[PDB]
Design a protein around this nucleic acid. Structure first.
Ligand SMILES: [K+]
Ligand SMILES: [K+]
Ligand SMILES: [K+]
Ligand SMILES: [K+]
Ligand SMILES: [K+]
Ligand SMILES: [K+]
Ligand SMILES: [K+]
Ligand SMILES: [K+]
Ligand SMILES: [Mg+2]
Ligand SMILES: [Mg+2]
Ligand SMILES: [Mg+2]
Ligand SMILES: [Mg+2]
Ligand SMILES: [Mg+2]
Ligand SMILES: [Mg+2]
Ligand SMILES: [Mg+2]
Ligand SMILES: [Mg+2]
Ligand SMILES: [Mg+2]
Ligand SMILES: [Mg+2]
Ligand SMILES: [Mg+2]
Ligand SMILES: [Mg+2]
Ligand SMILES: [Mg+2]
Ligand SMILES: [Mg+2]
Ligand SMILES: [Mg+2]
Lengths: 291, 252, 110, 87, 85, 97, 41, 95
RNA sequence: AACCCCUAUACCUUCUGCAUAAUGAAUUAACUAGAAAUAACUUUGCAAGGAGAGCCAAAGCUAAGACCCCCGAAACCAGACG
């Protein structure tokens, strides 16, 4: 122990630390260069005549009149529609298992975006066209946790890993407004707005979320048993009977397709200051929020 | 008569042991050694980082600086529209305006252009670490004294001045109480009439004040306050939104 | 950050292992990060200078440097190039050795 | 000396003067009142009934949803027709 | 220095002082109101949202009136909202 | 010529005046005060500069945006002209491209 | 903050002390002396 | 280039660049070949295949394009079924 | 031993090259000219996360330090004044 204890007892015999004996760490304060004196004056590093010394050289990209590189290349739609492309932050099974082992995500309760964000497992940016998380297969071989997880996209192998261990995986759509709310609920509650309804997927995404192969949240529940059995056969494992599990009720807990949060209905106003919930009773309002 | 024995509330790392300081009182001239208080080693025995003290001290001096210095360019000086004399033929140097920076009474070429702000913010964790370093340095150099309370027998400033002299507390003493509202009236009266003995609440503690004052006095409640706030920075998540907004386990 | 839950068997499926209790009796100690992981980090500059950093080192950092030099010398075939920073309690190593150092530090019980 | 009282976040809802010309317009609307209620609750003094859309506002909300957000059955039917044409 | 009030608010301040203060309340309200004239020389969008052909995304649309110059002689007639462009 | 022939009056600085004695107090208002207040809120000065930093062009744009409507006619004219001059300097002139 | 050179007098005397034994104006006029002093050195 | 915009005091992107080049997150820029749609009747198959290739830019051009585009265009994107997803990260690259 | 002896083609700018008979300068005093992003580098903090909502992240991220002059046309336009 030559560090902590030697650095403090050696301070006992030194002058008091004061505002008169402070200095920056060496290397943190590079010297400033001024155009004064033989070395740095005279032409001051600007050269001689031309546009150079006078400060009027052409814009960046200009090549002296030759048709510039960045113009003579043909246009091509590499980035066409980039700002309207849906993005999904990848969440690997390695990362998910890591979060569970450290107690950052609780597998005893349903896992959705809110719990993933609250555990600092994933960072979602709705303003950057993130539409949620995509569960990726990386780490499937060593994934052991039993979870009920709700994601936006899931690979076939990732789904098989979840369901071989006795867990349940569902793919759930969130519109940009809903995604912002579900990711950061507290900032939303401070706006004093009724909880909005979750919008349906766009027409181009309806096939994905109505298909049992993807465990879509709008798919026919009667088709899941066959889909679950097919993966068990393909990847050589026996489909567990989760109906016999002690956590079966929790494993079945799923949000209504119009519900952003478990246990909270559209049109409810959360009063955090008084720790209350306000529910509208007007028939017209109730019809709007329930439709 | 019973000793005031304070223990560290928050978990101390297993490889480290608490440091200790005498608990004293201001009720009498010889009322030293009233107790013995343990102090968390990560707050009062961190590595002595003088470079970090410089960073935080320099931040404190400059982050709220606004310079009001301003000069006029050649465009803002009164007049100066016309060309003072023809370009050619007069034998004189060529000039375009009587308010050129070459001219007496002309504009300033590269003068101050205020108001100018110097605002910047060190990372929150760095500013918290600086406070830890300052407390450790004071303890390591025997400039830190822990009090049970700041209650004086009288409000006379001479008593407090004489007390510091007898106890060899240097020329200047920073007195830190837990809260502004609950400061004892006696210490408030004494310090209000002094210049080198300054009374501040715990929320007002800062590196610059600690370095300007030779001696630092903390009450036992203040010690608990400081350990809680500074150690919270070591074990906290990266924020999801400003800590002023509701969290599950914050505040307290 | 929540404290890691108790596990019947270690290492966990992810590979995490808690620090040994009591701490090892060595001249130096290596504190875990706030996320409870070993503080060994890869670093790169100039697009080509691959380096390894051991952070949060307490006690005799020079003793750690000697131990690291003995541990890595067989792998490299020569003495590793290192920089000891007593002020920050950091040891910087030329080359990428994060995986080997992490396991090596874990075996010591840090 | 003695330090001045620490600067504190002045509690209570702050209601600007509606008849003051220099009052920012954003502090006078219903959206500002809703934020006061969410922050302070009943102490705000905002009638909680004013938080949901009014009957006229609810009519506009429902019209926009009908125009731009089709039902699942409509989208599924449109998908089938498009698929048949491609086939 | 700066003015206490923005210059664009000066005219409204004048209406709160002097004889203008004592004008009828109903009349002062008529002055303050500034309804959008009926579109005469331009065709309104007719909707608040439109689908942009180039990218196929729903975009907000706004009606920006065309500035109209009414000659002084227009004030003795009835031009139906028409003026010079 | 050019140098004074007598010593200037001695400089008297009261290092323990109230302003200096209390310099820095509450600079940790947030860290030690549950983050109810940000330290930048302690900054006093022009409304367009509190807790913000920028180069002269950025400062000019910010001031015109925030208080341009309240500025005196002559002042606003100079500000608009300054913004134009700086736009040309920073975007078109200099050693580097 | 406006900074001005305050000790220019002494800077001039560093050169002129070497030019006292020169002939003519180059023994007192800095513009002239400095060139001749450099040449002398 | 606009180094400081009049409205925001921020750097601007040269949009001519965005219309022609793809930036891979690893720093590489991809482009098409000039003339790949020009006078195909007079060009041989081997030449026409060369002209259809998507090719990388050199160091100097890459540095230039980086300066002519703001940070937004250098972020890591996670587009669904991106054809270029595999090429965003280098493998087995020494020095 | 002041000089006499010996040695020695002012300075700046500009140029392939200037004692040049190329430029500027009587002299003194005062005044009079390098402003910033993109990256990278250096030194701290924390670290698969960083940052005091936004952003970035396949060791990153945050903070800081450190680079981008002066004078000069003939003109052009608007509104006044003759
Ligand atoms: K030079
Ligand atoms: K040189
Ligand atoms: K420039
Ligand atoms: K493109
Ligand atoms: K010259
Ligand atoms: K000649
Ligand atoms: K010549
Ligand atoms: K000549
Ligand atoms: Mg010169
Ligand atoms: Mg020249
Ligand atoms: Mg040339
Ligand atoms: Mg002028
Ligand atoms: Mg003119
Ligand atoms: Mg001119
Ligand atoms: Mg002047
Ligand atoms: Mg690095
Ligand atoms: Mg020649
Ligand atoms: Mg010659
Ligand atoms: Mg000559
Ligand atoms: Mg010539
Ligand atoms: Mg610069
Ligand atoms: Mg023209
Ligand atoms: Mg004209």
């Amino acid at each position: 122990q030559g560090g902590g204890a030697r650095a403090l007892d050696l301070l006992r015999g030194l002058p008091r630390v004061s505002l008169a004996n402070l200095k920056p760490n060496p290397g943190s304060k590079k010297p400033e260069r001024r155009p004064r004196g033989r070395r740095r004056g005279r032409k001051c590093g600007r050269g001689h005549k031309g546009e150079r010394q006078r400060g009027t050289r052409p814009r960046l990209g200009f090549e002296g009149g030759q048709t510039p590189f960045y113009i003579r290349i043909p246009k091509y739609g590499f980035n066409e529609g980039h700002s309207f492309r849906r993005q999904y932050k990848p969440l690997s099974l390695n990362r998910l298992q890591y979060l569970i082992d450290l107690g950052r995500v609780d597998p005893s309760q349903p896992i959705d975006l809110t719990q993933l964000v609250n555990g600092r497992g994933v960072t979602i940016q709705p303003l950057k066209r993130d539409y949620g998380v995509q569960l990726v297969e990386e780490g499937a071989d060593t994934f052991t946790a039993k979870v009920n997880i709700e994601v936006q996209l899931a690979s076939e192998l990732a789904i098989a890993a979840i369901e071989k261990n006795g867990g349940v995986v569902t793919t759930a759509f969130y519109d940009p407004r809903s995604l912002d709310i579900v990711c950061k609920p507290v900032p939303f509650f401070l706006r004093g707005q009724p909880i909005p309804k979750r919008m349906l997927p766009p027409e181009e995404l309806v096939p994905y979320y109505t298909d049992a192969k993807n465990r879509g949240y709008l798919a026919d529940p009667a088709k899941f048993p066959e889909a679950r059995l097919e993966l068990a056969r393909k990847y050589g494992y026996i489909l567990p009977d989760i109906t016999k599990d002690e956590l079966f009720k929790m494993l079945c807990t799923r949000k209504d397709p119009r519900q952003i949060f478990f246990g909270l209905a559209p049109g409810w106003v959360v009063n955090m200051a008084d720790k209350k919930i306000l529910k509208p009773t007007d028939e017209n309002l109730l019809k709007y929020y329930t439709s | 008569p019973e000793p005031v024995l304070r223990k560290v509330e928050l978990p101390v790392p297993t490889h480290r042991r608490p440091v200790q300081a005498w608990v004293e009182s201001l009720r009498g001239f010889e009322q030293e050694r009233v107790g013995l208080a343990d102090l968390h080693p990560d707050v009062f025995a961190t590595a002595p980082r003088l470079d970090i003290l410089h960073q935080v001290a320099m931040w404190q001096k400059n982050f709220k600086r606004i310079s009001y210095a301003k000069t006029k360019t050649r465009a803002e000086v009164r007049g100066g529209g016309r060309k003072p004399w023809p370009q050619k033929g007069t034998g004189r140097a060529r000039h375009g305006s009587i308010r050129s920076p070459l001219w007496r009474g002309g504009g300033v070429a590269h003068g101050p252009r205020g108001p100018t702000s110097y605002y910047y913010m060190l990372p929150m964790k760095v500013r918290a670490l600086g406070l830890k370093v300052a407390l450790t340095v004071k303890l390591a150099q025997d400039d830190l004294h822990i009090m049970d309370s700041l209650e004086l027998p009288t409000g006379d400033p001479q008593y407090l001045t004489e007390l510091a002299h007898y106890r060899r507390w240097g020329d200047s003493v920073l007195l830190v109480d837990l809260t502004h509202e609950e400061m004892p009236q006696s210490i408030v009266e004494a310090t209000s009439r002094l210049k080198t003995f300054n009374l501040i609440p715990a929320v007002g503690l800062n590196v610059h004040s600690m370095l300007k004052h030779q001696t630092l006095v903390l009450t036992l409640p203040t010690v608990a306050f400081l350990e809680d706030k500074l150690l919270w920075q070591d074990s906290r998540y990266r924020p999801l939104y400003p800590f002023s907004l509701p969290y599950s386990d914050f505040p307290r | 950050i929540p404290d890691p839950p108790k596990h019947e068997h270690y290492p966990t499926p992810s590979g995490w292992q808690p620090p040994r209790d009591p701490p090892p009796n060595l001249p130096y100690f290596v504190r875990r990060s706030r996320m409870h992981n070993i503080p060994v980090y890869k670093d790169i500059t100039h697009g080509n200078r691959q380096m390894t950093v051991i952070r949060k080192v307490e006690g005799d950092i020079w003793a750690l440097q000697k131990d690291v030099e003995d541990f890595l010398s067989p792998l490299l075939g020569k003495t590793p190039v290192t920089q000891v920073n007593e002020v920050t309690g950091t040891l910087r190593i030329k080359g990428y050795f994060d995986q080997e150092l992490k396991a090596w530090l874990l075996e010591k019980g840090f | 000396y003695r330090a001045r009282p620490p600067p504190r976040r002045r509690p209570g809802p702050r209601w600007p003067d509606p008849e003051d010309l220099l009052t920012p317009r954003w502090q006078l609307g219903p959206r500002y009142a809703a934020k006061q209620f969410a922050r302070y609750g009943a102490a705000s003094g905002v009638v909680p009934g004013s938080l949901w859309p009014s009957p006229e506002q609810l009519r506009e909300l429902e019209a926009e949803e009908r125009e731009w957000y089709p039902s699942l059955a409509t989208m599924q039917e449109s998908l089938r027709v498009k698929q048949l044409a491609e086939e | 220095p700066l003015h206490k009030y923005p210059v664009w608010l000066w005219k409204r301040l004048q209406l709160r002082e002097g004889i203008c203060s004592r004008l009828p309340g109903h009349y002062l309200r008529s002055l303050e109101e500034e309804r959008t004239p009926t579109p005469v020389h331009y065709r309104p969008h007719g909707a608040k949202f439109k689908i942009n052909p180039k990218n196929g995304q729903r975009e907000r649309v706004e009606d920006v009136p065309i500035p109209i110059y009414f000659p002084p002689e227009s004030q003795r007639g009835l031009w139906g909202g028409e003026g010079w462009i | 010529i050019g140098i004074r022939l007598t010593l200037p009056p001695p400089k008297v600085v009261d290092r323990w005046n109230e302003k200096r004695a209390m310099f820095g107090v509450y600079d940790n208002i947030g860290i030690l005060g549950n983050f109810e207040k940000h330290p930048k809120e302690l900054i006093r000065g022009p409304i367009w500069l509190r807790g913000w930093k920028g180069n002269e062009l950025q400062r000019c744009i910010r001031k015109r945006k925030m208080v341009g409507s309240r500025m005196f006619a002559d002042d606003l004219h100079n500000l608009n002209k300054r913004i134009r001059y700086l736009y040309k300097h920073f975007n078109r002139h200099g050693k580097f491209r | 903050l406006r900074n001005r050179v305050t000790d220019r007098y002494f800077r001039i005397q560093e050169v002129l002390k070497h030019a006292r034994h020169f002939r003519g104006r180059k023994n007192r006029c800095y513009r002239l002396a400095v060139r001749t002093v450099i040449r002398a050195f | 280039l606009t180094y400081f915009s009049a409205r925001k005091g921020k750097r601007k992107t040269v949009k001519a660049v965005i219309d022609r080049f793809l930036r891979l997150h690893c720093g590489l820029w991809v482009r098409r070949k000039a003339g790949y749609k020009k006078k195909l009747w007079k060009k041989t198959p081997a030449r026409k295949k060369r002209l259809r290739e998507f090719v990388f830019c050199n160091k100097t051009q890459s540095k230039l394009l980086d300066k002519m585009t703001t940070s937004f265009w250098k972020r890591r994107n996670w587009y669904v079924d991106d054809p270029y997803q595999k090429y965003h990260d280098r493998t087995n690259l020494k020095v």
